[model samples]
Target: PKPGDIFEVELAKNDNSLGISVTGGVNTSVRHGGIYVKAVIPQGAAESDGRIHKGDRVLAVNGVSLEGATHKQAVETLRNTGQVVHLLLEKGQS
Candidate 1:
C-alpha cells in the first residue's frame, strides 16, 4: 500500500489472540487514524507465523475499519476482540 492499500492478516492464538504492540502517529496533519506497528514480541503469534512487520500501518481490526478512529480507540478495539485477531494492514509510508 503506497499511501492507502488494503490487506488482511489472521493471527491464531492458543490462549490469547495474537500478541502485538503498536504505536499511533499523533500528527493532526494526518488525522486521528494511522496506528504503527512498533514491535512484535519474541515468541509471540505475529512473530512465529511471520504475518506482521514493524512499521506496518493497521488499517482495520476484525471487520471494523480504523479510517477515522483514535489511537486509544484502536487499542481498545484490538483488545476487546479477545480472540482471533484479524488485521487489515497496509505497508506504512516511508
Candidate 2:
C-alpha cells in the first residue's frame, strides 16, 4: 500500500495489559507443533518481557485459537493485531 493511499488504519483503544511487538514465519515441528518459535531474537519484545519462550507452540493469539491453522492463516492473525500482542503459548513437555 502506498503512503497516501486509502488503507485501513487501526489505532490502539486503551493502554491495557497487552504485550510487546514481534515477527516470525511458518514452520511445522514435532517437538512443539503449531507455529513453532524456532529462533527467538534475544533482547526482542518476547525475550525482554520474559513472557513467551523460544520453543513454545503458538496456541492462540488473544484467545483466538490457532490450534490447527495453516501457515498463512497464523501469520495473518498475528499481523492483524494492534500494539500489544497477546500470544497464548504452549510449552513443550520435557
Candidate 3:
C-alpha cells in the first residue's frame, strides 16, 4: 500500500441484511459470553442482516489479525475488496 493506495475487503454476503433498521450505532449490554457487532448504520448490511453485532471484540478478519492493523491499512484493505469481509468475533458479557 502506498500513497493513494486503495485496498479492498471481502464482503460477507451472509452479512448482507435482508432487512435493516432506519439508523445504526445502537448498543446492547450483554450479560454472558458471546460476540456482538453493534450497528453504526442501522440502514446498512450489518443491521439489515440481523446478525454481526457491534461493540464486541473483533478477534480477527477473515482469520486475519486486526489487533495491530492501522486504520489506514484496514481501510485500504476494505477499499480494495468491497465484496465480503470475513471476521472472527469473540463473544463477551457487557
Candidate 4:
C-alpha cells in the first residue's frame, strides 16, 4: 500500500500486549511524524494480524484520535484498550 492510504486493523491482544513497539508522538522529532510502528513482534498479536508493519502511523485507537498525543499518552491509550484492539492506521512508504 502507498502512503496516505488509511486502513483499519483489528488485533486480538495476546496476554496484555499487542506485540508491537511504537515510537514518535507530539513530543518527538520523527521523520514523517505521528505515532509510528517501530517494530512488530514475532508470534504476537500484531504479527498474527499481518496488517500492521514498521513505519505505519497510528492515527487512532477505537475511533479515538491520537493526533496530538504524547508518547506516554499514546502508550497508555493502546494499553488501556482491552481485548480486541482496533487501530486506524495511515500506511507508510518504507
Best by TM-score: 4
Relative to the true structure, how large is the alpha-carbon lDDT of every model? 0.73, 0.52, 0.39, 0.89
Better of 1 and 4 by lDDT: 4
Q: Model 2, residue 36: what's the lDDT?
A: 56
Alpha carbon deviation, residue 61, candidate 3 (Å): 2.2
Q: Candidate 3: where are CA atoms >4 Å away? A: 1-39, 92-94
lDDT of 2 by residue, 20-85 (tens): 332334444443345755554554555555545445566677668876676677777877777765
TM-score pick, better of 2 and 4: 4
TM-score of each: 0.77, 0.60, 0.47, 0.92
Off by over 4 Å in 1: 1-5, 14-17, 25-33
Query: Candidate 1 on 9-62: residue-level lDDT in tens?
Result: 888864574657877744334435478787888888889978677777888878
Candidate 2 at 47: error in angstroms?
1.1
**In lDDT terms, how accurate is model 2?**
0.52
Provide the lDDT at 80 for model 3. Answer: 46
* Residue-wise C-alpha lDDT for candidate 3, range 1-94, written one tens digit per residue: 2322223323344344312121111122332222224443646655554434445444455555544444445434333443466655443234
Model 3 clashing-pair count: 34
